[PDB]
Amino acid sequence: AKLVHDVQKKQHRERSQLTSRSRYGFLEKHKDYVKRAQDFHRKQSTLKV
Amino acid sequence: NIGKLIYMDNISPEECIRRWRDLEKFVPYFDTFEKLAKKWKSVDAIKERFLTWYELQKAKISKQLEINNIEYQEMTPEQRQRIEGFKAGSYVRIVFEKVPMEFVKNFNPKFPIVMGGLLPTEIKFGIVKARLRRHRWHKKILKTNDPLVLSLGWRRFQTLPIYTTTDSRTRTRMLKYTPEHTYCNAAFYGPLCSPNTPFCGVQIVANSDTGNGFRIAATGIVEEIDVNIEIVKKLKLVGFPYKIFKNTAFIKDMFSSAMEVARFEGAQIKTVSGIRGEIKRALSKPEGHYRAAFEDKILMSDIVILRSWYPVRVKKFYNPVTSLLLKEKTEWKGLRLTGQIRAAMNLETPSNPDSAYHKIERVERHFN
Amino acid sequence: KMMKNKRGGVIDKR
Amino acid sequence: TMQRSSDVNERKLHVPMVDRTPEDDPPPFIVAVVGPPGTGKTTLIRSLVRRMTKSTLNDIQGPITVVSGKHRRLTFLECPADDLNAMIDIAKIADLVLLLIDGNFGFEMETMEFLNIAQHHGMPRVLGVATHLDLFKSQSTLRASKKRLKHRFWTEVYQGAKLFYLSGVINGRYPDREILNLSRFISVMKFRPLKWRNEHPYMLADRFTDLTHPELIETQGLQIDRKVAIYGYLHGTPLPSAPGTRVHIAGVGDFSVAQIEKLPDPCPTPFRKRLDDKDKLIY
Amino acid sequence: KYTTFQGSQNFRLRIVLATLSGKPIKIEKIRSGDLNPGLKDYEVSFLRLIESVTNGSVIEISYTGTTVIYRPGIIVGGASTHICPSSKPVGYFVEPMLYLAPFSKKKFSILFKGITASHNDAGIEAIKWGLMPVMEKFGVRECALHTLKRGSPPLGGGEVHLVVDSLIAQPITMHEIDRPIISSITGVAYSTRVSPSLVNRMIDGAKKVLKNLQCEVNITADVWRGENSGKSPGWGITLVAQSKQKGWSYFAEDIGDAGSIPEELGEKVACQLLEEISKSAAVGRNQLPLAIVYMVIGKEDIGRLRINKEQIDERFIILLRDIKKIFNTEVFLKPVDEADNEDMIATIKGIGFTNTSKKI
Amino acid sequence: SSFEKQQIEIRKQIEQLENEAVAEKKWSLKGEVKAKDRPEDALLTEELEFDRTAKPVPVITSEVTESLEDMIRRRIQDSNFDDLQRR
Amino acid sequence: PFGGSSHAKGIVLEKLGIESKQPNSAIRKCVRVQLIKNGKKVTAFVPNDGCLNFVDENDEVLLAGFGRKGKAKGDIPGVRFKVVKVSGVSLLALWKEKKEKPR
Amino acid sequence: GKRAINYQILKNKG
Amino acid sequence: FEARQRIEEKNKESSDYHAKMAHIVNTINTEEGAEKNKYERERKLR
RNA sequence: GCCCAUUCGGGUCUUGUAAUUGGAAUGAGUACAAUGUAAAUACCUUAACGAGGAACAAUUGGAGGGCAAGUCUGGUGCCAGC
Ligand SMILES: Nc1nc2c(ncn2[C@@H]2O[C@H](COP(=O)(O)OP(=O)(O)OP(=O)(O)O)[C@@H](O)[C@H]2O)c(=O)[nH]1
Ligand SMILES: [Mg+2]
């Protein structure tokens, strides 16, 4: 941090699943999706082999 | 003689030329070609018409100033009344008609009576686009469409600003508060000053509510003036999947009708996972339900998002303070802040229950 | 697109 | 010493702007005395005008223009200390600011608010004046708070502004030695031209009347928007003499001028040398 | 509320100076005692051009068409196009835009579409070579009238791209206390949809009148071939006299019509130019309006410009009366202190103008 | 007085937009508008803009069909076409 | 660089790169300044986009050399100077709100 | 009635 | 129809902006790095 | 936990924690005085009070991250960059 304020590089908090849509648990976000997608891709790669 | 003839404006202009001796037509009046031919067969009438940096700028401006003086040294009612008029240090009486009763009635000589001359710009109203800043010692953040009293030029006036951002210079879209420690843009309906003029802004000008804190709230300069601004407030349309396949899904409720989906066909949506997508066709029997195609298989626990933009309007509200027309001349009260209105009529502050953040804990992610 | 950011207009009462 | 000469000769260079202040008969420089309610001001304006014009001006009101030099005359006025509105107006039109600080209590938010409003509307010259130097027996804490006020004042004005120290009041007003060299500080100040002031024709009003008709008030009955004459010196750019010039009277609204009759100078400066006590005038 | 004028004279100058000054005007009795009374179509389309250029200005034509109410607004510019009617050429609409041109938010990039020339109006070469240099030394530096194609009357069909792209704050104060020495005399002879020999006939007539003065004469020649020629036959000639040490210029133009001899038109425009040189001093009789308009909307200083005796006329002083009627300023004509000629030096103290539309 | 009726019309718009500020939002300024949080089909009457994935399929017009038509007129006039050649 | 001095005073013409769509890009934090000594127009940086809204126009800036310690990534090599003051007030102090810019 | 200054305006550790 | 028009005007705007920014970047590069290298060249003589 | 090393790795060892908690210490400050001195200041001597965020609130500069249903740019999906 050379010219950055610590009140500027704050922590944005992430949002939860809506309580009306709560039976489908855990609204998944981009880290969860990439954990899903690269698993699918490595298993499709070994299936293709 | 000729200047008095020109500005004596009860006689016709041809009478001015007659007793000295029309612009849609651009080219001027010439003689007949034959008269001009016999006049300019000769040529000899006009044969003599034919044939450091800082101190430099200061020298140019002092040269202009000595030109000003040596060309002012002229007729006395010309200089001292009408060609420049009342330079500085002249003691004048100045009469205003239709001054309000309350000034003469409540004239208390402690409070100074200042007057300033408005330019051609500063009598115009409209949207002023500033860049402003919460003042570093003002405690509370500022809110859009809460009034604050600006001191913009000679005028002090309470207005309703709306703080904007040009998010990486694409929109000019609408914030809901000013930032904590930097500048934002702003736009307020007020008297159009020139650009590059600075201003202060104050939440509270009275003394019954003067509290213990710092009273000046906003600082800024004026970037631009205009008669209209085009600023936007993001609205997203959220809908949920109810029938998912590979690479395509049926999305439930962001629309109420197939006419609405037909209006919005081809639009790019995305889930909250950032999976991009596009809406393709409205389904027939369930009305607002449609078929979208995504980058890959979305889940049943997702929400799709259509980021759109709704235009928002500045509120044409303007009251100047007129503090000298009061019997107290402090204790001026204008529009209240929104927290003051809620505290007055005891309405609780609006709380969306699913807008509040939580402490999310990840479950471990294992696959088959 | 011509109307979008205008604020004036001639008022032809003829 | 050549590098010193270059780096010192560099900081003479500034942005070349116009002046628009005349050299023959300049207006009286507007001196605004600004303080929180309860320090100096009245006593200070009285003491300065008594030293300047040899005239006990008990019970002041309004702007007070005196002649304090051979060519520098200046106008004294006092802000009402509770009004941020009058604070804002005299911040926008003042040329010199005598910034009253209760040195026993310390800095205060009224003088801090004036300093920020002036800083944003075109910071005039500011001479800080710290009174109430009756701290305790402790001349040690007198010197300590003296230094702390000077440094905190130096972070708000340029580093090297003048903080002045007034001792206790003696017989109704301040010690005349201290007011003598305070006026010595006011007499050399070397004002630099601002921007809003030097593209705008403004005027502080030292005289006010309504030239309405009292039997017209008897006819219509006190609801009348009545005409008003406003007398004073005008500063800045030349205000044009034709009727109909638009004017904001800062606190009552927007008007246009009807007629201007310029008057001979009520407080004129007279034509090494010294200033005669005959010519130390007061208006 | 409204400054009131009478009659349909100086109509473009009234609307232009109202846009500069920001003052609401009324123009009353637009040819009311006439058989077809009211505003004509070319000045109505000029009002539409004003609504294109500005923003937030409300123009309010009456029922009978004989009075107009102009409440002006902010000059914003932008890119546009104007399909002006056949009653007036593109010069009638690009001449009043050269006043409003450097004082807008966004730079002027307009292309006008219609007839190029007229007997009683400004041409492309007139606008360019005469009226651009006086702006070029009043403060603007990037201004250009391009011809993409040109159309002679009556059918026309020529487009003209006016682009100004120096947005100055205010024009500088003029100081021309001299008569500028004419260094050269050049020109342009144009012809569309006719034979290329008419241009050389025009050039030879103009230069055989000009041959007895001991300066240097140079007339450039353009025939217009193809789609750039427009829909009608036409030809014309425009001469300028060029003071090169300061940049001043004095122009004269005309166009031929059905039955016109090109040597006759060339010698006529040559003699008309020499008479403009005679009746001129540091401006032209037609460059004088926007010269003193930029002097009156300069800074709040004194700007002085030399003029001669014969440039004073009913047009010039009705210009001065309209200037004082709108923003209350006078010109001071002081005579020079040498007496082989009658030249005044008009000193105008400019109003305190800035352009407040350009974003900072 | 004159300032009195100025002050009461000022106070009128003071009151109406202070209880605009207290009172309930428009739906269109609020984000995350679902289907059940709107006037039912307020969106046809909305004039709302957004972005799309790809340029949609071109509607064939008389001018574009005569564009490629006189294109192939030029092409088969000068016979500058491209086929295979025998080996 | 400036001749014989270490700093130089200058006049802000216009914020170059004000339409750059990337925050804290070297094109964006990049100001054009007319030096007052010899009149020539140079180009200077500023510490960030956040302190870019302390200069507006004809601001009496003060500018020193830059001193790149290594070939940067998003650089534009060919701008030599950095803005170190504005209207006689250090804009690092302005950026951390220790002073207020006077006008 | 004395609106005393506070610590962030006094010590100015911005 | 609005789809095709909006897409092609956004493409035109982006292609104009990229040209403008690249132009100002390498004009600042060329006609000021020449002066940087000229100062370095006449500082290497000292 | 720490240390070395381009890599794989290797070497070593009571080390941590906005965890609780305890009574002692006094100094800046506030102040009795007396001394000093023409007198007063100051030095010297000195009873009383004076610490838990000991808030009785020291800075300055550097290195590196990490985050959003956020924004921007590029293009050979889910990426790269800013
Ligand atoms: N001890 C002491 N008292 C002072 C000093 N200066 C002013 N005062 C007192 O301040 C009291 C209040 O009156 P002013 O000083 O005139 O008040 P002001 O500063 O004009 O402020 P306002 O009351 O708001 O008008 C006076 O009666 C003075 O005795 C000073 O240096 N020392
Ligand atoms: Mg008082």
PDB file of C-alpha atoms in Angstrom, chain B residues 133-245:
ATOM      1  CA  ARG B 133     -16.662  16.159  -0.402  1.00  0.00           C
ATOM      2  CA  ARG B 134     -17.855  15.558   3.122  1.00  0.00           C
ATOM      3  CA  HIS B 135     -15.748  17.922   5.191  1.00  0.00           C
ATOM      4  CA  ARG B 136     -13.114  15.953   7.088  1.00  0.00           C
ATOM      5  CA  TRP B 137     -14.243  17.229  10.499  1.00  0.00           C
ATOM      6  CA  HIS B 138     -17.974  16.873   9.902  1.00  0.00           C
ATOM      7  CA  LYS B 139     -18.878  13.661  11.679  1.00  0.00           C
ATOM      8  CA  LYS B 140     -21.941  12.224   9.940  1.00  0.00           C
ATOM      9  CA  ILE B 141     -21.966  11.158   6.280  1.00  0.00           C
ATOM     10  CA  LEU B 142     -24.189  13.027   3.837  1.00  0.00           C
ATOM     11  CA  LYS B 143     -27.227  11.550   2.104  1.00  0.00           C
ATOM     12  CA  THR B 144     -28.679  12.217  -1.327  1.00  0.00           C
ATOM     13  CA  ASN B 145     -31.978  14.119  -1.400  1.00  0.00           C
ATOM     14  CA  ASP B 146     -31.282  15.491   2.036  1.00  0.00           C
ATOM     15  CA  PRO B 147     -31.136  19.267   2.016  1.00  0.00           C
ATOM     16  CA  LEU B 148     -28.020  21.181   2.746  1.00  0.00           C
ATOM     17  CA  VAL B 149     -27.439  24.919   2.692  1.00  0.00           C
ATOM     18  CA  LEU B 150     -24.902  25.854   0.059  1.00  0.00           C
ATOM     19  CA  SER B 151     -22.854  29.035  -0.036  1.00  0.00           C
ATOM     20  CA  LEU B 152     -22.384  29.340  -3.784  1.00  0.00           C
ATOM     21  CA  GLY B 153     -21.182  32.771  -4.777  1.00  0.00           C
ATOM     22  CA  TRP B 154     -23.164  35.524  -3.128  1.00  0.00           C
ATOM     23  CA  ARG B 155     -26.153  33.288  -2.490  1.00  0.00           C
ATOM     24  CA  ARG B 156     -26.809  30.988   0.415  1.00  0.00           C
ATOM     25  CA  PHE B 157     -29.625  28.591  -0.347  1.00  0.00           C
ATOM     26  CA  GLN B 158     -30.903  25.235   0.852  1.00  0.00           C
ATOM     27  CA  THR B 159     -31.013  22.608  -1.858  1.00  0.00           C
ATOM     28  CA  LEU B 160     -31.502  18.886  -2.478  1.00  0.00           C
ATOM     29  CA  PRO B 161     -28.354  17.415  -4.031  1.00  0.00           C
ATOM     30  CA  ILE B 162     -27.879  13.948  -5.420  1.00  0.00           C
ATOM     31  CA  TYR B 163     -24.416  12.430  -5.333  1.00  0.00           C
ATOM     32  CA  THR B 164     -23.254  10.596  -8.427  1.00  0.00           C
ATOM     33  CA  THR B 165     -20.345   8.545  -9.680  1.00  0.00           C
ATOM     34  CA  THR B 166     -19.076   7.934 -13.188  1.00  0.00           C
ATOM     35  CA  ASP B 167     -18.178   4.315 -12.524  1.00  0.00           C
ATOM     36  CA  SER B 168     -14.972   4.007 -14.534  1.00  0.00           C
ATOM     37  CA  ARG B 169     -16.241   6.909 -16.666  1.00  0.00           C
ATOM     38  CA  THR B 170     -19.138   4.982 -18.244  1.00  0.00           C
ATOM     39  CA  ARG B 171     -22.300   6.275 -16.579  1.00  0.00           C
ATOM     40  CA  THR B 172     -22.968   9.074 -14.254  1.00  0.00           C
ATOM     41  CA  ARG B 173     -24.834   6.858 -11.849  1.00  0.00           C
ATOM     42  CA  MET B 174     -26.364   7.646  -8.526  1.00  0.00           C
ATOM     43  CA  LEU B 175     -24.863   6.998  -5.110  1.00  0.00           C
ATOM     44  CA  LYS B 176     -26.947   6.948  -1.968  1.00  0.00           C
ATOM     45  CA  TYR B 177     -24.420   8.659   0.298  1.00  0.00           C
ATOM     46  CA  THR B 178     -21.310  10.696  -0.167  1.00  0.00           C
ATOM     47  CA  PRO B 179     -18.077   8.721   0.272  1.00  0.00           C
ATOM     48  CA  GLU B 180     -16.306   8.661   3.590  1.00  0.00           C
ATOM     49  CA  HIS B 181     -13.076  10.453   2.796  1.00  0.00           C
ATOM     50  CA  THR B 182     -12.931  11.502  -0.858  1.00  0.00           C
ATOM     51  CA  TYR B 183     -14.788  13.409  -3.535  1.00  0.00           C
ATOM     52  CA  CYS B 184     -17.898  12.436  -5.414  1.00  0.00           C
ATOM     53  CA  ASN B 185     -19.857  14.296  -8.005  1.00  0.00           C
ATOM     54  CA  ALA B 186     -23.111  16.023  -7.188  1.00  0.00           C
ATOM     55  CA  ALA B 187     -25.931  17.795  -8.955  1.00  0.00           C
ATOM     56  CA  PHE B 188     -28.329  20.315  -7.505  1.00  0.00           C
ATOM     57  CA  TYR B 189     -30.998  22.596  -8.888  1.00  0.00           C
ATOM     58  CA  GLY B 190     -29.781  26.063  -8.054  1.00  0.00           C
ATOM     59  CA  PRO B 191     -28.562  29.325  -9.554  1.00  0.00           C
ATOM     60  CA  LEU B 192     -25.961  28.602 -12.216  1.00  0.00           C
ATOM     61  CA  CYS B 193     -22.648  30.074 -11.170  1.00  0.00           C
ATOM     62  CA  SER B 194     -19.638  29.829 -13.444  1.00  0.00           C
ATOM     63  CA  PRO B 195     -17.537  26.660 -13.438  1.00  0.00           C
ATOM     64  CA  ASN B 196     -14.469  26.393 -11.202  1.00  0.00           C
ATOM     65  CA  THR B 197     -16.032  28.304  -8.378  1.00  0.00           C
ATOM     66  CA  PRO B 198     -15.783  26.832  -4.879  1.00  0.00           C
ATOM     67  CA  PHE B 199     -18.473  26.457  -2.263  1.00  0.00           C
ATOM     68  CA  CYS B 200     -19.250  25.265   1.240  1.00  0.00           C
ATOM     69  CA  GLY B 201     -22.327  23.455   2.435  1.00  0.00           C
ATOM     70  CA  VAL B 202     -23.897  23.223   5.853  1.00  0.00           C
ATOM     71  CA  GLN B 203     -26.441  20.877   7.383  1.00  0.00           C
ATOM     72  CA  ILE B 204     -27.713  23.192  10.128  1.00  0.00           C
ATOM     73  CA  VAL B 205     -27.534  26.981  10.214  1.00  0.00           C
ATOM     74  CA  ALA B 206     -29.689  27.696  13.294  1.00  0.00           C
ATOM     75  CA  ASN B 207     -28.541  27.879  16.920  1.00  0.00           C
ATOM     76  CA  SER B 208     -31.190  25.877  18.766  1.00  0.00           C
ATOM     77  CA  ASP B 209     -29.870  22.711  17.110  1.00  0.00           C
ATOM     78  CA  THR B 210     -26.255  23.842  16.783  1.00  0.00           C
ATOM     79  CA  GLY B 211     -25.072  20.958  19.013  1.00  0.00           C
ATOM     80  CA  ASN B 212     -21.425  20.363  19.818  1.00  0.00           C
ATOM     81  CA  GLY B 213     -20.062  19.185  16.476  1.00  0.00           C
ATOM     82  CA  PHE B 214     -18.572  20.888  13.465  1.00  0.00           C
ATOM     83  CA  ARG B 215     -21.201  22.668  11.441  1.00  0.00           C
ATOM     84  CA  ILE B 216     -19.755  22.982   7.933  1.00  0.00           C
ATOM     85  CA  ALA B 217     -20.472  19.656   6.244  1.00  0.00           C
ATOM     86  CA  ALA B 218     -19.533  19.790   2.567  1.00  0.00           C
ATOM     87  CA  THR B 219     -16.807  21.439   0.513  1.00  0.00           C
ATOM     88  CA  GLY B 220     -16.417  21.446  -3.228  1.00  0.00           C
ATOM     89  CA  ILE B 221     -15.986  23.209  -6.540  1.00  0.00           C
ATOM     90  CA  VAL B 222     -18.377  23.508  -9.464  1.00  0.00           C
ATOM     91  CA  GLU B 223     -17.463  21.365 -12.466  1.00  0.00           C
ATOM     92  CA  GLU B 224     -20.191  22.193 -14.980  1.00  0.00           C
ATOM     93  CA  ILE B 225     -23.590  23.808 -15.351  1.00  0.00           C
ATOM     94  CA  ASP B 226     -26.430  22.594 -17.533  1.00  0.00           C
ATOM     95  CA  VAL B 227     -30.169  22.781 -17.995  1.00  0.00           C
ATOM     96  CA  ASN B 228     -30.550  19.001 -17.689  1.00  0.00           C
ATOM     97  CA  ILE B 229     -28.662  16.069 -16.249  1.00  0.00           C
ATOM     98  CA  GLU B 230     -29.051  12.423 -17.248  1.00  0.00           C
ATOM     99  CA  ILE B 231     -28.201  10.300 -14.217  1.00  0.00           C
ATOM    100  CA  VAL B 232     -29.263   6.751 -13.513  1.00  0.00           C
ATOM    101  CA  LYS B 233     -30.009   4.404 -10.578  1.00  0.00           C
ATOM    102  CA  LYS B 234     -29.232   0.710 -11.186  1.00  0.00           C
ATOM    103  CA  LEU B 235     -32.162  -1.631 -10.976  1.00  0.00           C
ATOM    104  CA  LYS B 236     -31.579  -5.345 -11.232  1.00  0.00           C
ATOM    105  CA  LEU B 237     -34.378  -7.748 -12.026  1.00  0.00           C
ATOM    106  CA  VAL B 238     -33.991 -10.970 -10.064  1.00  0.00           C
ATOM    107  CA  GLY B 239     -35.513 -14.285 -11.027  1.00  0.00           C
ATOM    108  CA  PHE B 240     -34.958 -17.813  -9.948  1.00  0.00           C
ATOM    109  CA  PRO B 241     -34.563 -21.076 -11.859  1.00  0.00           C
ATOM    110  CA  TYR B 242     -37.116 -23.828 -11.569  1.00  0.00           C
ATOM    111  CA  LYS B 243     -36.116 -26.320 -14.276  1.00  0.00           C
ATOM    112  CA  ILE B 244     -32.436 -26.751 -15.060  1.00  0.00           C
ATOM    113  CA  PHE B 245     -30.708 -28.789 -17.738  1.00  0.00           C
TER     114      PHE B 245
END
